[PDB]
Scaffold this active site. Structure first.
Site, PDB file in Angstrom:
ATOM      1  N   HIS A  61       0.817  -1.156  -0.071  1.00 37.87           N
ATOM      2  CA  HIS A  61       0.063  -0.009   0.110  1.00 37.87           C
ATOM      3  C   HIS A  61       0.961   1.217   0.156  1.00 37.87           C
ATOM      4  O   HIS A  61       0.429   2.252  -0.659  1.00 37.87           O
ATOM      5  CB  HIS A  61      -0.864   0.054   1.287  1.00 37.87           C
ATOM      6  CG  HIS A  61      -1.674  -1.049   1.478  1.00 37.87           C
ATOM      7  ND1 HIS A  61      -2.785  -1.734   0.904  1.00 37.87           N
ATOM      8  CD2 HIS A  61      -1.384  -2.071   2.420  1.00 37.87           C
ATOM      9  CE1 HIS A  61      -3.077  -2.776   1.259  1.00 37.87           C
ATOM     10  NE2 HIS A  61      -2.327  -3.327   2.287  1.00 37.87           N
ATOM     11  N   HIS A  91       5.327   6.559   7.261  1.00 44.12           N
ATOM     12  CA  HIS A  91       5.029   6.104   6.091  1.00 44.12           C
ATOM     13  C   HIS A  91       4.279   7.700   5.137  1.00 44.12           C
ATOM     14  O   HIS A  91       4.093   8.597   6.037  1.00 44.12           O
ATOM     15  CB  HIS A  91       4.053   5.001   5.639  1.00 44.12           C
ATOM     16  CG  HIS A  91       2.589   5.398   6.342  1.00 44.12           C
ATOM     17  ND1 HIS A  91       2.255   5.361   7.660  1.00 44.12           N
ATOM     18  CD2 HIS A  91       1.489   6.054   6.005  1.00 44.12           C
ATOM     19  CE1 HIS A  91       1.136   5.562   7.860  1.00 44.12           C
ATOM     20  NE2 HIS A  91       0.627   6.375   6.907  1.00 44.12           N
ATOM     21  N   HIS A  93       1.761   8.942   1.928  1.00 47.27           N
ATOM     22  CA  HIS A  93       0.807   8.852   0.860  1.00 47.27           C
ATOM     23  C   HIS A  93       1.004   9.913  -0.106  1.00 47.27           C
ATOM     24  O   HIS A  93       1.466  11.026   0.218  1.00 47.27           O
ATOM     25  CB  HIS A  93      -0.596   9.094   1.273  1.00 47.27           C
ATOM     26  CG  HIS A  93      -1.094   8.362   2.638  1.00 47.27           C
ATOM     27  ND1 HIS A  93      -1.738   7.143   2.673  1.00 47.27           N
ATOM     28  CD2 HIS A  93      -0.718   8.487   4.036  1.00 47.27           C
ATOM     29  CE1 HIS A  93      -1.903   6.633   3.820  1.00 47.27           C
ATOM     30  NE2 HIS A  93      -1.386   7.579   4.728  1.00 47.27           N
ATOM     31  N   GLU A 103      -3.720  13.355   2.124  1.00 49.83           N
ATOM     32  CA  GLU A 103      -5.081  12.915   2.558  1.00 49.83           C
ATOM     33  C   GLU A 103      -5.821  13.997   3.363  1.00 49.83           C
ATOM     34  O   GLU A 103      -7.082  14.329   2.923  1.00 49.83           O
ATOM     35  CB  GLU A 103      -4.632  11.730   3.815  1.00 49.83           C
ATOM     36  CG  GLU A 103      -3.940  10.586   2.957  1.00 49.83           C
ATOM     37  CD  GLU A 103      -4.354   9.275   3.571  1.00 49.83           C
ATOM     38  OE1 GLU A 103      -4.241   9.242   4.793  1.00 49.83           O
ATOM     39  OE2 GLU A 103      -4.877   8.460   2.952  1.00 49.83           O
ATOM     40  N   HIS A 116       3.177  10.339   7.286  1.00 53.26           N
ATOM     41  CA  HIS A 116       2.207  10.127   8.657  1.00 53.26           C
ATOM     42  C   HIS A 116       3.348   9.486   9.803  1.00 53.26           C
ATOM     43  O   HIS A 116       4.135   8.618   9.046  1.00 53.26           O
ATOM     44  CB  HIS A 116       1.302   9.258   8.193  1.00 53.26           C
ATOM     45  CG  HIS A 116       0.103   9.863   7.827  1.00 53.26           C
ATOM     46  ND1 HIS A 116      -0.948   9.259   7.329  1.00 53.26           N
ATOM     47  CD2 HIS A 116      -0.231  11.128   7.713  1.00 53.26           C
ATOM     48  CE1 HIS A 116      -1.785   9.946   6.658  1.00 53.26           C
ATOM     49  NE2 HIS A 116      -1.435  11.243   6.879  1.00 53.26           N
ATOM     50  N   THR A 195      -6.353   6.123   8.594  1.00 56.43           N
ATOM     51  CA  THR A 195      -6.979   6.439   7.022  1.00 56.43           C
ATOM     52  C   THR A 195      -7.037   5.171   6.429  1.00 56.43           C
ATOM     53  O   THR A 195      -7.334   5.288   4.785  1.00 56.43           O
ATOM     54  CB  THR A 195      -6.119   7.269   6.496  1.00 56.43           C
ATOM     55  OG1 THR A 195      -4.898   7.087   6.113  1.00 56.43           O
ATOM     56  CG2 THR A 195      -6.228   8.846   7.405  1.00 56.43           C
ATOM     57  N   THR A 196      -6.658   4.146   6.862  1.00 64.00           N
ATOM     58  CA  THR A 196      -6.499   2.897   5.817  1.00 64.00           C
ATOM     59  C   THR A 196      -7.275   1.719   6.839  1.00 64.00           C
ATOM     60  O   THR A 196      -7.301   1.861   8.172  1.00 64.00           O
ATOM     61  CB  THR A 196      -5.200   1.959   5.703  1.00 64.00           C
ATOM     62  OG1 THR A 196      -4.423   1.855   6.999  1.00 64.00           O
ATOM     63  CG2 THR A 196      -4.366   2.650   4.631  1.00 64.00           C
TER      64      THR A 196
END
Ligand SMILES: CC1(C)O[C@@H]2[C@@H](CO[C@@]3(CNS(N)(=O)=O)OC(C)(C)O[C@@H]23)O1
Ligand SMILES: [Hg+2]
Ligand SMILES: [Zn+2]
Length: 256
Positions: A61, A91, A93, A103, A116, A195-196
């Site tokens: 991901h 990590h 995004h 996000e 994040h 958020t996942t």
């Protein structure tokens, strides 16, 4: 299983994880004119000096840099947080293009990416128990825009080659996450969620106002990563962000 494509992406998550339509989901749009300065917020303390990185992992991901969280080395405290939160991993995004990838948004503005830094409340003993608590996690969020290189990010950039596909990991010891911070610690804070999937409503979000800038060549290397495992058809790891979710009467507070 879940991902970010048309058939398994954010619009489908609710079927396996009904909390997707919950009361404190993340990310959200930060409406700067509705956010209020909170005098009761204590100074924010980001203490990463003794941070102990372990490895970097393409988990299908994004990629995770993991840390040794078996003692109070890298901790977040202050701001809206009570007690001590231990850094466990970070990590990013990012998008397929520079005009999308974050996000959280700020007055609907999307940044090129968002970092994040994930921390767990030490009164719960371990990460796994923390995620059963409304105040189990604190995530520090940092926006990325494209400008000059971020020198503190290059070591991450340079290793992505080695972890191109899902399941690959590399040694990543002695990385100092202090090199990923902007100069200001001005922030907005609100209660929210992962958020996942499993989208657990366990997070105090602390989103820094000042973006970091990263180079176009740095972002391009994120975009060379793969969602697939080795020996499978190439699916570029891009657009691995969940869009803004309903605020639902929560209040976003400003530290400034
Ligand atoms: C890269 C990505 C999406 O983020 C990683 C992992 C799964 O989800 C996380 C939390 N994600 S977040 N975006 O901070 O809420 O939860 C854990 C801590 C399991 O790892 C985070 O894969
Ligand atoms: Hg929770
Ligand atoms: Zn994240």
């Amino acid at each position: 299983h879940w991902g970010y494509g048309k058939h398994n992406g954010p619009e489908h998550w609710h079927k396996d994880f009904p909390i997707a339509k919950g009361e404190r989901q993340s990310p959200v749009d930060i409406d700067t004119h509705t956010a209020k300065y909170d005098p009761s917020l204590k100074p924010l303390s980001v203490s990463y000096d003794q941070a102990t990185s372990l490895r970097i992992l393409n988990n299908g991901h994004a990629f995770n840099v993991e840390f040794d969280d078996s003692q109070d080395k890298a901790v977040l405290k202050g701001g809206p947080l009570d007690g001590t939160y231990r850094l466990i991993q970070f990590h990013f995004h990012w998008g397929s293009l520079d005009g999308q990838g974050s996000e959280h948004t700020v007055d609907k503005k999307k940044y090129a990416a968002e970092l994040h830094l994930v921390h767990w409340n030490t009164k719960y003993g371990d990460f796994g128990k923390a995620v059963q608590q409304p105040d189990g996690l604190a995530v520090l969020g940092i926006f990325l825009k494209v400008g000059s290189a971020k020198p503190g990010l290059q070591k991450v950039v340079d290793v992505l080659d080695s972890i191109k596909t899902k399941g690959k990991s590399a040694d990543f010891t002695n990385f100092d996450p202090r090199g990923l911070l902007p100069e200001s610690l001005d922030y907005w804070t609100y209660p929210g969620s992962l958020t996942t999937p499993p989208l657990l409503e366990c997070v105090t979000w602390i989103v820094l106002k000042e973006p970091i800038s990263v180079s176009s060549e740095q972002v391009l290397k994120f975009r060379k990563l793969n969602f697939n495992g080795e020996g499978e058809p190439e699916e570029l790891m891009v657009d691995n962000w969940r869009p803004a979710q309903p605020l639902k009467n929560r209040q976003i507070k400003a530290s400034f």
